Task: structure prediction
Amino acid sequence: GSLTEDGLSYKEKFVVRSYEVGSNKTATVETIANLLQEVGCNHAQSVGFSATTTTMRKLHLIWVTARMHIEIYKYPAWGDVVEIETWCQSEGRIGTRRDWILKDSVTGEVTGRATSKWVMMNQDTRRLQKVSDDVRDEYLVFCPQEPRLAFPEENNRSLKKIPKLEDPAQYSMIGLKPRRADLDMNQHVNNVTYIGWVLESIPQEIVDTHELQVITLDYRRECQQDDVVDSLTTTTSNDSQFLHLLRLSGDGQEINRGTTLWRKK
Amino acid sequence: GSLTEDGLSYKEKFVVRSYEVGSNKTATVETIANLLQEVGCNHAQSVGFSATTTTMRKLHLIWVTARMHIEIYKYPAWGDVVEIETWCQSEGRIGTRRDWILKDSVTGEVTGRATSKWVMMNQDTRRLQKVSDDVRDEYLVFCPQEPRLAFPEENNRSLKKIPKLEDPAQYSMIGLKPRRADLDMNQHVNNVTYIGWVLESIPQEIVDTHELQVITLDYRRECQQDDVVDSLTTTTSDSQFLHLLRLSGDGQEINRGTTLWRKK
Ligand SMILES: CC(C)CNC(=O)c1nccn1C
Ligand SMILES: CC(C)CNC(=O)c1nccn1C
Result:
């Protein structure tokens, strides 16, 4: 991987592995989500981040994902090379946005795109705080000044409000627990695990007959290493749509909400 | 990746990813096990296997792992390149062996080694069969003739008999279920998932203060997509543990193993 000529974005090629593909011999949405995370970390590394700034480490501040939105047109096949370009942009004091474009390395065609909203939080108290001016300037030199959006469309699906699923859910997968492979280097549950847990309540018949086109996920609260999760799905719709909810198995405390859009094979 | 000059082994370089490392910023044993699987599949692909031969497909025969043994000296750090060399050898009618050598791409030093025993099974009836002779010859041309062992030392850990853990276990992790990410392209539970499930019953105190040096795992039965698993561990000792994976209901055995850990 390498920063582009202008130094304002990062590109990386990946060869799709055998264990990274599903029944269609193409990469799963969790494999894609892992590759976006990987290219995102390599971009921060390439511009001097061990992605916390000098001031953030001092104040015990971290960047946390609030929303993730992925749209896939063609999932890469096992053995294919996928090129991913990523960049960040500040969206005022609300936080930052990280965008990705996935391309077929051979043809150059856009096979997918993604966007994410990040907010500043104290690692210890978990309290959100707006981006201070001194923090903002530290990372403005690594972002393009003019707007550059993976989702520029007038009324695009990446900014739609997500409602709360009402009980009874149509489908459910109960008692989901993270294992050590689900934890990152800081022993927190990886953001990608929640995508897999959302998809666990989709019936196998939808998975076998449809392709996942769009997934939007809101992150409300993190699942601890010793927490148990319940995954809920209700159909909201030639295309299938679902409303999703992740909540703590005990008191029913919300951890995530989302929607998926599937198209017939 | 590419076959070596003699065409009798395969090499591949891998850069360790951010999500592939644990709390020590080094690759987990499941990441290593995934890379061995990846280099093993790329080797079969490079020699014409689209690793069943054309005769095996006609008979509905597959290769199944019976035993896995991994020894790690140094886990690669996040961002490092690891070079893995793999090869196969026939071990008579019992089955085939696949071996691996892991090296630091920068220094050339051996950082780990692995071995696995594979047996021929009918995919439908699940009945174990000898490799026959017409099937033998089809893949003998891709293996070295003289012995080439990742574990040559007479009386080594990779061939030691594994006993069955007696109840009550010292530690346990119950109700383990596979999710879709745990399944391979054929909707079977990936053989790497069982390693993660074995390690789930090791106390976090051992993981935080020790490094996993050796792991030997016997595969007795596959866990179905809708099965629930119980993971059991008892200390037998450096720390040593005896492991057992069994079906959450009737207690039907799926795996047995041992681990060896060294103080950091
Ligand atoms: C939004 C989910 C899929 C996580 N993806 C990321 O972008 C990420 N997580 C940690 C560091 N990065 C770059
Ligand atoms: C590495 C351990 C978990 C065993 N897995 C493999 O080697 C394998 N599975 C399918 C194809 N290969 C080469």
